[PDB]
Amino acid sequence: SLRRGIYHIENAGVPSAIDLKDGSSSDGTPIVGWQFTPDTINWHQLWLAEPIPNVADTFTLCNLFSGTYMDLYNGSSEAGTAVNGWQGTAFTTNPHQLWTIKKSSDGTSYKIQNYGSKTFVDLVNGDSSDGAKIAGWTGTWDEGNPHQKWYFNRMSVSSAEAQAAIARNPHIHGTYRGYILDGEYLVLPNATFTQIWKDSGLPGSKQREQIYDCDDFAIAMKAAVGKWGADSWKANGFAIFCGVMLGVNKAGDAAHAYNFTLTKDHADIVFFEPWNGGYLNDIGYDSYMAFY
Amino acid sequence: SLRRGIYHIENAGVPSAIDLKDGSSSDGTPIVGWQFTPDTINWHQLWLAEPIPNVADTFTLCNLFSGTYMDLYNGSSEAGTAVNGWQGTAFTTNPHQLWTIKKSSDGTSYKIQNYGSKTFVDLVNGDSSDGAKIAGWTGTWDEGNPHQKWYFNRMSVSSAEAQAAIARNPHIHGTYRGYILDGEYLVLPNATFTQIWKDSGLPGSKQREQIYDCDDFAIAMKAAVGKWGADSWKANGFAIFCGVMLGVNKAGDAAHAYNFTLTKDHADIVFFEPWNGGYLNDIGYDSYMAFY
Ligand SMILES: C[C@@H]1O[C@@H](O[C@@H]2[C@@H](O[C@H]3O[C@H](CO)[C@H](O)[C@H](O)[C@H]3O)[C@@H](O)[C@@H](CO)O[C@@H]2O)[C@@H](O)[C@H](O)[C@@H]1O
Ligand SMILES: C[C@@H]1O[C@@H](O[C@@H]2[C@@H](O[C@H]3O[C@H](CO)[C@H](O)[C@H](O)[C@H]3O)[C@@H](O)[C@@H](CO)O[C@@H]2O)[C@@H](O)[C@H](O)[C@@H]1O
Ligand SMILES: C[C@@H]1O[C@@H](O[C@@H]2[C@@H](O[C@H]3O[C@H](CO)[C@H](O)[C@H](O)[C@H]3O)[C@@H](O)[C@@H](CO)O[C@H]2O)[C@@H](O)[C@H](O)[C@@H]1O
Ligand SMILES: C[C@@H]1O[C@@H](O[C@@H]2[C@@H](O[C@H]3O[C@H](CO)[C@H](O)[C@H](O)[C@H]3O)[C@@H](O)[C@@H](CO)O[C@H]2O)[C@@H](O)[C@H](O)[C@@H]1O
Ligand SMILES: C[C@@H]1O[C@@H](O[C@@H]2[C@@H](O[C@H]3O[C@H](CO)[C@H](O)[C@H](O)[C@H]3O)[C@@H](O)[C@@H](CO)O[C@H]2O)[C@@H](O)[C@H](O)[C@@H]1O
Ligand SMILES: C[C@@H]1O[C@@H](O[C@@H]2[C@@H](O[C@H]3O[C@H](CO)[C@H](O)[C@H](O)[C@H]3O)[C@@H](O)[C@@H](CO)O[C@H]2O)[C@@H](O)[C@H](O)[C@@H]1O
Ligand SMILES: [Ca+2]
Ligand SMILES: [Ca+2]
Ligand SMILES: [Ca+2]
Ligand SMILES: [Ca+2]
Ligand code: NA
Ligand code: NA
């Protein structure tokens, strides 16, 4: 089954993503095909998939920016029926907003079936245009039709995935303890991570003994990413990935506080130095504590 | 010996504190007697005492606000010599800024002797006026003269004192681990702690599942106290006390993140709820992790 998480949903036939037009929270805002930039935040094109209990392979899809739900208009089974953003809730019984999401016949892309209508999310005519209609359409689970096939490009990690990435890092002290704060995290491109750092005001902060030293920089950077999360997204039920670590050098006579993020493939952590905005595979310390 | 730490220095004869006039960083700013309010930050009346290596019971005294040092003018041994704020460094060899500080004959108050002149810090005539002259004056270590006797009212804790306060709290989980970030901390009155909370903007923050929940509130409050430290004080070599704790309820099926501060007597911790600005002796959780 598709994991709970945040997805960038990309048509299998043409490089168009599922896009809530202008990110509007208005009821009945069109959901359309739109081009995208890899290794960015695609602000209108992120979807939180929430599994429904006691309904196999069935989800709500909440737009991360608008906090509104992918909705088949009046649940109609007519081919060409509008797919829109609409107000709802994560565990609604409204079948207009319930979507069965299972692998296509190519074993990699998915099809997205409305739970009520049993019709499929369809990029009409495979139109690659920006603002191309997406509709509910007749189809089958097994057919090759790329209009109705969608890559779910996973943008989030579970706490368990983050814990795995840390555990397979070689720069962890024997005495390490990790403290998990949330359940599901949006992984930032370094470009975005860096922009939050710049916007924090840390780049202009002076290192001062105890009163604003490494621990103040690291905790300030985490607070700044936390604030950016709440201020940026209207959806709930996830966090933004930004770690704090305390580390000790090899000689065991110097400690340091710093941040860490995750690679694009979600497999490994990268250390961030909030003094100078550097990314390092080796920051010259072994982490004895992390919270994230 | 007097501990390294931050002190509010209060005359034994009249309720006047040692005050750097208008907190000015200007060289030659008068240091004067001035009245004070207990359980506040007395902005111009806090002094960081830094022990000198290989000189017994001898210190620099740095004004926490100005970052300038208590200085006997031209190191003169003449009675009535000005005591001023002056630019210097924590481990200076300038005897104008070096002060031997040992218990008076009453065993509770101290006398403050210039290391160069061997004359004593004197509230001239015991004048209780706001802006009364403080000078270097002839005297002895043993005499009762209250003009030259000074209570060192300790405003800071060592990391060891903070660790003791946590350890004698009854709301600590069996699995607790504590992570120490700095060495010496200014303890805030609750009135000040509360004001930093209000000024953070947290009072108007909405609790949102994962994206701005208890851990975001607690880390935001710590960052806010860290920022207030750096922005408020020009001295270095200390931090502001504000803790983060993670806790678990008695049933072991609910966790919470929150802050903690220290009592006026520095002996115990008090829990702070950054959701609503409440202080609690029991927040209904046992702490399994803290960083401070
Ligand atoms: C190029 C075209 O592809 C397929 O048609 C699609 C449509 O496919 C879907 O709807 C049709 C009925 O209209 C049928 O139910 C099919 O099984 C289902 O996948 C649909 O995707 C529309 C809207 O984008 O575009 C095309 O018309 C195929 O059936 C056609 O023969 C033809 O090869
Ligand atoms: C009331 C007064 O108290 C004492 O005199 C102090 C001064 O005391 C100090 O200086 C004197 C010499 O002027 C002497 O060296 C003494 O041992 C030393 O403590 C001084 O504090 C000034 C400035 O505030 O005020 C008083 O004059 C005492 O010696 C006097 O006899 C008298 O009791
Ligand atoms: C918030 C906004 O984001 C961008 O504009 C969006 C646009 O974003 C996508 O398409 C553009 C080209 O139009 C790029 O490929 C981006 O990488 C995509 O994410 C669409 O989502 C449309 C339709 O909803 O809305 C626009 O606001 C960007 O161009 C803006 O400057 C701005 O940052
Ligand atoms: C059958 C119908 O179901 C609900 O109305 C849906 C509507 O539902 C959502 O939005 C409305 C406000 O328009 C309410 O907030 C619901 O709580 C939401 O779930 C949308 O799905 C639209 C667009 O497809 O269709 C309506 O039929 C319900 O509110 C109605 O009373 C009625 O039961
Ligand atoms: C920063 C400033 O602090 C207060 O004024 C100081 C003053 O503070 C002390 O004396 C006042 C009465 O004048 C109260 O007792 C305070 O509790 C004391 O801390 C002195 O330090 C003088 C001399 O240096 O400077 C003033 O600025 C306060 O009254 C101001 O509103 C302001 O907050
Ligand atoms: C003997 C004298 O000592 C120093 O001058 C002090 C002076 O020292 C401090 O302030 C000056 C600037 O005025 C420098 O930054 C020093 O580094 C500071 O330690 C003050 O103590 C004043 C007031 O009592 O007295 C001067 O004598 C030194 O700079 C001189 O060259 C000279 O060696
Ligand atoms: Ca949480
Ligand atoms: Ca610090
Ligand atoms: Ca530190
Ligand atoms: Ca959180
Ligand atoms: Na399910
Ligand atoms: Na010493």
Numbering used by the authors:
A (entry chain AAA), B (entry chain AAA): 2 to 293
Paper quotes:
The Marasmius oreades agglutinin (MOA) is the holotype of an emerging family of fungal chimerolectins and an active Ca2+/Mn2+-dependent protease, which exhibits a unique papain-like fold with special active site features. While acting as a dimerization domain, the papain-like domain of MOA retains the characteristic L-/R-domain partition of PLCPs. As additional feature, the MOA dimer carries two binuclear metal-binding clusters, symmetrically placed at the dimerization interface (Grahn et al., 2009). MOA requires the presence of calcium or manganese (II) to switch from the inactive form to an active protease (Cordara et al., 2011, Wohlschlager et al., 2011).
Compared to papain, MOA exhibits a positional and functional swap of a glutamine and a tryptophan residue (Gln19/Trp177 in papain, and Trp208/Gln276 in MOA). The single-site substitution of Trp208 or Gln276 to either Ala (W208A, Q276A) or its papain counterpart (W208Q, Q276W) led to a partial loss of the enzymatic activity and decreased thermal stability. A MOA variant where Trp208 and Gln276 were both changed to their PLCP substitutes (W208Q/Q276W) completely lacked proteolytic activity and also had lower thermal stability than the wild-type enzyme. The side chains of both residues are relatively poorly defined by electron density and exhibit higher B-factors than in the MOA wild-type structure. The catalytic cysteine (Cys215) can be modeled in two different conformations, oriented approximately 90° apart. In the crystal structure of the double mutant, the Cys215 thiol group was found to be chemically modified to arsenocysteine. The formation of an arsenocysteine has previously been reported for other thiol-based enzymes (DeMel et al., 2004, Winger et al., 2008), and is a consequence of the reaction of cysteine with cacodylate, which was used as buffering agent in the crystallization conditions. However, simply substituting both Trp208 and Gln276 for their papain counterparts in variant W208Q/Q276W was insufficient to preserve enzyme activity.
